[PDB]
């Protein structure tokens, strides 16, 4: 295990690449322009990252399309693509410490979570998708004797992937895994708030055996290079994870361009329902606190709306606050630190604005609620719990994407479900009960892509992850993730 | 068995409904306004059809939402939904001749086609989807022993369906089948060029046992009621079959509204590739003629591009011309007629304008090329073949949606594949050969949702139907059609 | 609704067929020998049933083999087999009253059960299998580009089915459904204790459209005609439902002959586990009584072992005794009878022998325990409950196949599981509890093909049915039953 | 650069320390009786090691151990991802000991060292790896039930699995079974053939080193009529899987009926037809494949192309190509990497092959290649690749499995007769068709009653292809995800809500 002093030492002795990666080579943007990569830890300078635009996107697509048509990857044997992506995953573990440090410095996540959660799950996501390549079987229909009906899946071609900043490496690997496994060419557009991890792994892919031009990274802003890719006439599929606002615009961009397939993972207001007959209220309390404090509340499936039955609310709420004592906002370079820094100033101001909206809506602040650690020159906010919150208030409707918890009461099982579904979102939800019938009937009633019973943030690579309604469409992880990067073909042969 | 005089007699004594169908009852538009429905058979009047608008759509959505929330259909047992849908299918067969007569008068296709193909296939489409309901299994993931990972599917809720005019009944049932089977509430919006059969079957559904509000029909215009459904914040999913322009516009409406799931099926320029070593050149010639003449060429997967190998072009071309003679444009109410009228004047003018474009591109007219049966008062056109066509010409790249064929020569298998894939479309393709390797390798190389080998227009309800690229997304028929009306939920239960 | 007088009248005026059905025709045994088919209702004579032997098996197989090779049914289109088997199902319903009467007269079960349960389920079982034929897809493997790898299923050919007497018609259709659907020829050997219904539906099959020789019925003894089919060198597959002892002999016969596939469904000693925290204790008691009294306890999945927790046993037992009083043995031809007669004298003596064994083991007779209705000439035994039973006693370990209940108690969940799995059988089990974790963890711990939570005798045609250990191998119902009558073929094609 | 020679492999043979004890409960041990048998080599007749000769007492002890390990849940209730990771390490360990395992193979049963290393060990490792990777990719079912009801259809390990593996592919066949069986969480007792026990004895230790708990994977060397019979008759063995002859396979099925009605999955003999049409894409390639289909692994392959069905119109031009191609397959020292054809497993097998060759002459068939014992002066058992011409499908050498490099050439007039001749057999394990015609390739393939049909190639299919026979060639399938079904039970859990 590395010491805090070791991480800071390596942070100084760290050479960072900021160039784009096209056709197996690192290069600058066509304009040569660049934005500064700032660290939210202490406002330090990390590197100067290439700022791509339309010209870079046009070049990357041609390279991606040519690589796809060549067949170097798209028509490579399934078992061989599997072995290549496994080496890709293995290389992520070999360079785990650097990747973890890059991410922590990039967006502020505690170094322990960058190494043991981010990097570890990222390599697993690539490996699992690789292992699944030659385990998938296509279909043969029941036809008359003198006829053969084949139903097969083929790679779409050129795939554009726009990755957020909360889990830059992990979300990249959730997209890269199945997309590369199916044999597509990928153009990765990382978030401008965290481009370092995407830039680094692009070289690792080529070292693993991924042919030139199959995996490309175009750093920059969403309104520039991101918009260019979404509007490009030769991009077949665009996958995205982020806000509902941006996701809506990307779908419009598709309707204005080439009718490209769009698969979106928007935001969410995931309810965490706690009944009176919960097996362990303490465990549920620790979970409810962790569901809003982990990754500084910067999680799409954060347990923002904590629903508690009136029978236990007076006992349960003190346990949540007591459990939240352990989630300290500290130095992201310290392994012992539970909660790190927010991504940037704008994010903090937004979170603090919602905290301000919390008071103005008439909510009773019972924990935190203020900016912390300003002396570091960093961006930090302490975990926050608002009591007496109804589902009509602003802080209950809108997604804060910060460590702010709304506690809501319900009378019975019917109301809890009514409140939980009272949202345009539907990414996740949780149920805490020891009753067999109620657990299942509630989970079925909830309109969410992921329902966790007697736990929060469950499910591994075998669990399809996505949302209902405005939380997005399509699924990441599992075998269902492959469907987003493939086209069905019905080959009917007359014998 | 019925003669020409029989169908013309029934057409004069036919009482046609023109109202919308909302919540189990027929009703005029909220504005009371209507539009005239004319017959392209001879320009006769049929009935006044309700012209719905935003208000009507607003009412139907709440009706559909309430029906879905009640659970009268959405939470009915799968086996019971099966029985009802089968009863629905049977009712189409009992009213087969009326539905066939309505279809023929509405949009012009021959009566024998309406009865023996359209009505039969539509009923089969409903029955097949019904039979499939309780045969589909969801998933249980491989999890640790102290955990249960359920992966299930649930109906999306309210489903809007915009249906084309070329196959009004059949395309409606391709949507209605899987949409109703999954337990969703459906709001059908038929084409203004052919609203009758959609209006009629709405009554048959409730007679079969479909609860009120589950299946609603709103006739009208795309920019009014269609636009309203596409922009409604409470519509979960939109399905569509039509033009690329409209399909692209619908996707924008979703991005502007509630980010609703959109499944589109656009046009196509399907290449019909005939090699020298085809098993039977005569049979391929018959299929080549039929691939452009059937349903007046108003077919999405019409063989509008006949790709012939150069070494057999001089022998195969006359065979196609001779075979095309068998398809005579005539009185659609005559059982012997195999080529009916075009849907309306504007469609005829579009076809005629493309024939003019054929001459101006330098192509050699070798069959048809003129408007026919003008004295009847209906819009008709001769099946048309152009020779000496290159894939760069206007008639070879743009969809005509008429019986206009483009004959293009190729040298070898590599050129054929290149010419075939050189199109923004990708809905269907066909290969004619007796060689094992060449048949399979070509079929794999074609970018089309359906590849027919040694036959044309193949595949039944077991064959998924849809497009690559700008021919659309998602699949009709097969079990895959059900996935367009369901949402995946990952329920991970801690034990 | 027919009355007791109606059924008794139809019984006396019923003409019964007792010949075998080979190659589409009724005919006597080759030796001309017959056996007397008597009714357990009152000992009356019903018909002289053909007593087939080796020579009849040899002829039937040749007929079945020729029918399979002709491809009239085996190579008929999947959708055509579906439509025919659906007509088969309809013919069972059109002859429901006749079939129900035969069943009741043949083996003694209540007329209401034969009609509203047995016939209705038999027809549904056939219908469900038929609907499933063209819903099943075979597989295409993930192979290198220059290769096509198909994984398909083909009918085995000649299938021999030996069915029991407890559910003569239903068990027949459980085999017939998937066997005929997949295209096989079937030779059905009904139990000599209940041959009538099998003989009847054979004619119904050919009326529906089943080709001659595809479905044959050979009535007779197990040691004569059953042994001949099991030893026949041209029978591809043998399916069976009955006792463990007979199932073992058949597996030996196969090993001595042509190594034919053997799928067995032997006996069971199903534990019905009732926890203290069951949702409805009244419903649990009502179900427990029905689990041993329904069909005269002649059910392989009968709850012959009732497991009650100590903290509720003294309160739960009188509820079971009271519930059992509703199940009164009586005239099977009376619509209001819920408990009929045992199949014959041998079965009655066997059941009575185990009741005496219960006394010998030291158990306490707390309900029933005697033969009844001896004056009628039939064989009846009243529902019997033994209390104070340990899992070492004879009546707890050996299958009785009568309405005899053994009540065993346990301290905790661990002991319940240990006692439940302490048996050479593993066909079914039930768990009654309201706790989420306890329900699932117990169900996963029980070694039974079927596990019913908070209910008994659950699962429709979607649920596979079979046993662990000595309860047999393979599954009936669901889509898994199809695999017992098909062979896998891997066709690897080099392109 | 470096290159292993014949002398290098021979020197490795004299250095090699060979383990011969049984492996029960994570430890090596003798048989309870202490009896052993002499493991000899068909390479030159040399002594290899004294291998434990187990019996009833050892089978009883191994089952109890296997049962206890299963019930403990140390492996059976371990997470799928963790079972996956353990078996990958197991697969990696086979690769890290590839040279030793391959040498053990060659010395034991006589196949060429280049085959043992590049084919057997490599495939066996990949088979374990593939089955491991597939563990958490498989999904159980949820049925379409009424709303207030939940219907789960799940799979669970059977418990104790006895595996009886043949001698022709000792390591590979072992891993075809061990892969899916251990992946599903079962305890396995492996009984290797008495003609080749060494590799099974070896890998047992490697499983333990990889993380497989004690008693989960046991190895009992000995005879089939003793310990093999004991496992088949045991009342606590849940499942018996087997690959070998039709006669023994039938016998095991009897033992199951006589004991506890244990599930029995078998892969018996075969007489696979290799069908070559006039319109074959490449006659030269088909001729090379035909020769290889009978010479590879000394013809001791279940799916060997023992029947060559040739269309009459090309018989006179196809046969000389096959005879020429057969010359490339020369019997030689198995320890020489250049050798492509090794030795037969023992003297008994050699005599049987020689007996069938004599029967070929007696049936009236014409000898056109090989037909004699060779390399007799080496002290080893070798037989030349043999081709008989003018064979009918009624002759003894055409209907009976030879399990040696003896090919039967049979003529047919057309596709209809070809299918008839090809199906005229009690077996149905494999078949091949060579044609360039689309319709004829598919229709013939569909008409052939065989578990594996290869078109325009021979011995095709990787781990994604199910492998097993029709009729008397056995039941069930090895490889693919279908293999897992032989080691699991279906459970329908219907929960009323
Ligand atoms: K940054
Ligand atoms: K019209
Ligand atoms: K009887
Ligand atoms: K040996």
Cβ-contact C371, C345 below 8 angstroms? no
Instruction: Give the total residue count for chain C.
Output: 495
**Which ligand lies nearest the alpha carbon of C168?**
3
Chain C 373-402, residues with CB within 8 Å of chain D CB atoms: none
Catalytic residue chosen out of the listed positions D105, D194, D267, D311: D267
Q: Which one of B136, B279, B490, B494 would you mutate to disrupt binding with A, by most A Cβ within 10 Å of its Cβ?
A: B490
**Does the CB of B5 have a partner CB in chain D at under 8 Å?**
no
- Which A residues 329-368 touch B at CB under 8 Å? none
- Measured between beta carbons, the chain D residues lying within 8 angstroms of C488 are 451, 466, 468, 477, 482
End-to-end CA separation in angstroms for chain C: 66
Distance of CA C388 to the CA centre of its chain: 30
Whether the CB of B411 is below 8 Å from some CB of chain C: the reply is no
The encoded tokens of residue A33 equal: 């322009």
Resolution of the experimental model, in Å, one decimal: 2.5
B141 close to A (CB below 8 A): yes
CB A359 within 8 A of CB A340: no
Q: Is there a contact between A145 and D446 if contact means CB atoms under 8 Å apart?
A: yes
Q: C74 to chain B nearest CA, in Å?
A: 20
Nearest-CA neighbor of A404 among A479, A353, A461, A463?
A353
DSSP C54-119: HHHHHHHHHHHHHHHHHTTTTTS-HHHHHHHHHHHHHHHHHTHHHHHHHHHHHH---HHHIIIIII
CA–CA distance from C287 to each of A336, B457, B458, C110 (Å)?
A: 57, 55, 53, 19
Distance (angstroms) between ligand 4 centre and the Cα of D245 equals 18
Q: Which residues of A touch D79 (CB under 8 A)?
A: none
**Across the interface, do B461 and C134 touch by the CB < 8 Å criterion?**
yes
Alpha carbons A226 and A166: distance in angstroms, whole number: 18
For residue A196, give the ligand nearest its CA: 1
Chains contacting B with at least 3 CB pairs below 8 Å? Answer: A, C, D
Give the residue numbers of C marked as catalytic.
265
- Ligand number nearest to the C-alpha of C45: 3
Contact C184, C129 (CB under 8 A): no
Distances (CA, A) of D346 to D40, D301, D336: 9, 15, 19
Task: For residue A477, give how far its alpha carbon lies from the nearest alpha carbon of chain D (Å).
Answer: 11
DSSP state of A140: E
State how far residue D143 is from chain B, nearest Cα, in angstroms.
5
- Which residues does chain A have within 8 Å of residue D497's beta carbon, measured at their own beta carbons? 436-437, 440-441
Which of these is catalytic: A265, A286, A309, A382?
A: A265
Give the ranges where A257-310 is alpha helix by DSSP (H). 281-293
Contact D441 B436 (CB under 8 A): yes
In angstroms, the first-to-last Cα distance of chain A is 65
* Residues contacting D271, CB < 8 A, separation 6+: D306, D307, D398, D399, D400, D401, D425, D427
Residues less than 5 Å from ion ligand 2, measured at CB: B 37, 106
In DSSP terms, B488 is beta-bridged to B153
Beta bridge partners of C453: C431, D495
**How many A×C Cβ pairs under 8 Å?**
74
3-state SS assignment for residue A60? helix
Locus of tokens 């606190």: A289
Distance between D481 CA and the closest CA of chain C, angstroms: 11
> What is the distance between the alpha carbons of residues C466 and C473, in angstroms, rounded to a whole number?
7
Whether C124 and C358 have beta carbons less than 8 Å apart is answered as: no
For residue A403, the CA-to-ligand 1 centroid distance in Å is 19
Q: Which residue of C has its CA nearest to B480?
A: C135
Instruction: Quote the minimal CA–CA distance from A201 to chain B in Å.
Output: 30
CA distances from B169 to B44, B213, B422, C126, D332 (A): 21, 20, 32, 31, 74
Indicate the SS3 state at residue A41. Answer: coil
Among B78, B436, B452, B486, the residue to mutate for chain D (most D Cβ within 10 A): B436
Q: Which residues, 6 or more positions from A213, have their beta carbon under 8 angstroms from its beta carbon? A: A22, A23, A24, A63, A64, A66, A67, A185
CA nearest C80 in A: which residue? A144
Residue C280 CA to residue D441 CA, distance in Å, equals: 63
C-beta atoms of D439 and B135 within 8 A: no
CB D388 within 8 A of CB D400: no
User: How many other CB atoms sit within 10 Å of the CB of residue A75?
Assistant: 17
Two structure tokens written together for A75: 């028509």
C132 touches B: beta carbon within 8 Å: yes
Q: How far apart are CA A195 and CA A199, in angstroms?
A: 6
**Per-residue 3-state assignment (H helix, E strand, C coil) for chain B:** CCCHHHHHHHHHCCCCCCCEEECCEEECCCCCCEEEEECCCCCCEEEEEECCCHHHHHHHHHHHHHHHHHCCCCCCCHHHHHHHHHHHHHHHHHCHHHHHHHHHHHHCCCHHHHHHHHHHHHHHHHHHHHHHHHHCCEEECCCCCCEEEEEEEEECCEEEEEECCCCHHHHHHHHHHHHHHCCCEEEEEECCCCCHHHHHHHHHHHHHCCCCCCEEECCCCHHHHHHHHHHCCCCCEEEEECCHHHHHHHHHHHHHCCCCEEEEECCCCCEEEECCCCCCHHHHHHHHHHHHHHHHHCCCCCCCEEEEEHHHHHHHHHHHHHHHCCCCECCCCCCCCCECCCCCHHHHHHHHHHHHHHHHCCCEEEECCCEECHHHCCCEECCEEEECCCCCCHHHHCCCCCCEEEEEEECCHHHHHHHHHCCCCCCEEEEECCEHHHHHHHHHHCCCCEEEECCCCCCCCCCCECCCHHHECCCECCCHHHHHHEEEEEEEEEC
CA–CA gap between residue B477 and residue B469 (Å, rounded): 19
C493 close contact with B: CB closer than 8 A: yes
- B314, exposed or middle or buried, with CB in 10 Å at 0-12, 13-18, 19+? exposed
Tokens encoding A473: 């469409």
Cβ proximity of D487 and D239 under 8 Å = yes
Of the candidates A403, B469, B477, the one whose C-alpha atom is nearest the C-alpha of residue C134 is B477
> What's the rounded Cα separation, in Å, for the pair B453 and B81?
37
The answer to whether B254 contacts A251, with C-beta atoms less than 8 Å apart, is: yes
For an interface test with B, the pick among A150, A243, A259 (most B C-beta atoms closer than 10 Å) comes out as A259
Please name the method used to determine this structure: X-ray
| Domains in chain D, CATH or no CATH each | 1-269 (3.40.605.10), 270-462 (3.40.309.10)
Cβ–Cβ of C494/D460 closer than 8 Å?
yes
A-interface mutation test, from C142, C148, C494, most A Cβ less than 10 A away: C142
- Of residues D462, D495, D493, D459, the one with CA closest to residue D480: D462
Nearest CA in chain D to C473: D263
Sign of CA dihedral B467, B468, B474, B475: positive
Instruction: For chain D, list the contacting chains (3+ Cβ pairs, <8 Å).
Output: A, B, C
Q: Which residues contact C400 (CB under 8 A, 6 or more apart)?
A: C297, C304, C350, C351, C354
* Nearest-angstrom CA–CA distance, D429 and D409: 19
Rounded Cα gap, residues A137 and A135, in angstroms: 7
Q: Does B15 touch chain C (CB under 8 A)?
A: no
| Ligand closest to the CA atom of residue D192 | 4
Contact predicate D292/D304, CB 8 Å: no
Q: Count the neighbouring beta carbons within 10 Å of the beta carbon of residue A36.
A: 10
Give contacts of A 266-325 with D, CB under 8 A. none
Beta bridge partners of C305: C271, C406
What SS3 string covers chain D? CCCCCHHHHHHHHHHCCCCCCEEECCEEECCCCCCEEEEECCCCCCEEEEEECCCHHHHHHHHHHHHHHHHHCCCCCCCHHHHHHHHHHHHHHHHHCHHHHHHHHHHHHCCCHHHHHHHHHHHHHHHHHHHHHCCCCCCEEECCCCCCEEEEEEEEECCEEEEECCCCCHHHHHHHHHHHHHHCCCEEEEECCCCCCHHHHHHHHHHHHHCCCCCCEEECCCCHHHHHHHHHHCCCCCEEEEECCHHHHHHHHHHHHHCCCCEEEEECCCCCEEEECCCCCCHHHHHHHHHHHHHHHHHCCCCCCCEEEEEHHHHHHHHHHHHHHHCCCCECCCCCCCCCECCCCCHHHHHHHHHHHHHHHHCCCEEEECCCEECHHHCCCEECCEEEECCCCCCHHHHCCCCCCEEEEEEECCHHHHHHHHHCCCCCCEEEEECCEHHHHHHHHHHCCCCEEEECCCCCCCCCCCECCCHHHEECCECCHHHHHHHEEEEEEEEEC
**Tokens describing residue D463:** 């781990």
Cα–Cα distance, A237 to A215 (Å, whole number): 15
Encoding tokens for residue A78? 């399934």
Q: First CA to last CA across chain D, in angstroms?
A: 70
Any A CB within 8 A of C142 CB? yes
Tokens for D65, please give them: 């151990």
| CA D137 – CA D184 distance, rounded (Å) | 12
B433 touches chain D (CB under 8 A): yes
**What is the distance between the terminal CA atoms of chain B, rounded to a whole angstrom?**
66
D39 Cα distance to chain centroid: 20
C-beta separation of D108 from D199 below 8 A: yes
Contacts 24+ apart (CB under 8 A), B97-103: B97/B2, B97/B10, B98/B14, B98/B200, B99/B169, B99/B197, B99/B200, B99/B201, B101/B7, B101/B10, B101/B11, B101/B14, B102/B14, B102/B16, B102/B196, B102/B197, B102/B200, B103/B168, B103/B169, B103/B194, B103/B196, B103/B197
CB C75 within 8 A of CB A146: no
Query: What angle is formed at CA A195 by the lines to CA A192 and CA A201, rounded to 5 degrees?
Result: 155
B6 torsion bin: left (phi>0), alpha (psi -120 to 50), beta (else): alpha
Tally of CA atoms within 13 A in the half-sphere of C80 that contains its CB = 13
Question: Which of B455, B445, B449, B454 has its CA nearest to residue B421?
Answer: B445
**Nearest alpha-carbon partner for D174 in D194, D156, D197, D195:** D197
C53 vs D463: CA distance, rounded Å: 46
| C-alpha C329 to ligand 3 mean position (Å) | 18
| Main-chain dihedrals φ then ψ at residue A433, nearest 5 degrees | -160, 155
* Cα-only R_g, chain C: 23
Dist. CA A121–CA A117, nearest whole Å: 6
Give catalytic status of residue A265 as yes or no. yes
Cα B495 to chain centroid, rounded: 48
Please check whether residue A69 is in contact with residue A213, taking contact to mean a CB–CB distance below 8 angstroms: no
- Residues of B labelled as active-site residues: 265
Select the residue of D472, D491, D493 nearest C259 (Cβ to Cβ): D472
């Amino acid at each position: 295990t590395l010491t805090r002093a070791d991480w800071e030492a390596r942070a100084k002795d760290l050479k960072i690449e900021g160039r784009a990666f096209v056709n197996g080579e690192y290069s600058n943007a066509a304009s040569g322009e660049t934005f500064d990569c700032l660290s939210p830890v202490d406002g330090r300078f990390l590197a100067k990252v290439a700022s791509c635009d339309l010209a870079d996107a046009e070049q990357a697509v041609k390279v991606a399309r040519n690589a796809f048509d060549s067949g170097a990857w798209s028509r490579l044997a399934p078992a061989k693509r599997k072995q290549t992506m496994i080496r890709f995953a293995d290389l992520l573990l070999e360079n785990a410490e650097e990747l973890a440090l890059l991410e922590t410095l990039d967006m502020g996540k505690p170094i322990s979570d960058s190494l043991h959660i981010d990097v570890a799950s990222a390599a697993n996501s690539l490996r699992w998708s690789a292992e699944a390549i030659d385990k998938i079987y296509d279909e043969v229909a029941a036809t008359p004797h003198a006829e053969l009906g084949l139903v097969t899946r083929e790679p779409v071609g050129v795939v554009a992937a726009i990755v957020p900043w909360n889990f830059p490496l992990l979300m990249s690997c959730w997209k890269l895994g199945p997309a590369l496994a199916t044999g597509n060419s990928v153009i990765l557009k990382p978030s401008e708030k965290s481009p370092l991890t995407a830039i680094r792994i692009a070289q690792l892919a080529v070292e693993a055996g991924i042919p030139k031009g199959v995996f490309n990274v175009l750093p920059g802003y969403g309104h520039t290079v991101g918009k260019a890719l979404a509007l490009h006439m030769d991009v077949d599929t665009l996958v995205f994870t982020g806000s509902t606002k941006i996701a809506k615009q990307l779908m419009v961009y598709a309707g204005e361009s080439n009718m490209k397939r769009v698969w979106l993972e928007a935001g969410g207001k995931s309810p965490n329902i706690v009944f009176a007959d919960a097996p362990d209220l303490k465990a549920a309390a620790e979970a409810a606190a962790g569901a809003i404090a982990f990754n500084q509340g910067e999680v799409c499936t954060a347990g923002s709306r904590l629903l508690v039955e009136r029978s236990i609310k007076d006992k349960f709420l003190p346990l949540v606050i007591e459990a939240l004592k352990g989630w300290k906002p500290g130095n992201p370079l310290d392994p012992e630190t539970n909660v790190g820094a927010l991504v940037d100033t704008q994010q903090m101001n937004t979170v603090l604005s919602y905290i301000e909206a919390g008071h103005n809506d008439g909510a009773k602040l019972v924990a935190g609620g203020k900016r912390t650690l300003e002396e570091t020159g960093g961006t930090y906010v302490e975990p926050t719990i608002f009591d007496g919150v109804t589902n009509a208030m602003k802080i209950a409707r809108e997604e804060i994407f910060g460590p702010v918890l709304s506690v809501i009461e319900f009378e019975d099982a019917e109301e809890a479900v009514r409140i939980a579904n009272d949202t345009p979102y539907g990414l996740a939800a949780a149920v805490w009960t020891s009753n067999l019938s109620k657990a299942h009937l509630t989970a079925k009633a909830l309109r969410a892509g992921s329902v966790w019973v007697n736990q929060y943030d469950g499910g591994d690579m075998t669990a399809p992850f996505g949302g209902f309604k405005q939380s997005g469409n399509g699924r990441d992880k599992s075998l269902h993730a492959f469907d987003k990067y493939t086209e069905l073909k019905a080959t009917w042969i007359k014998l």
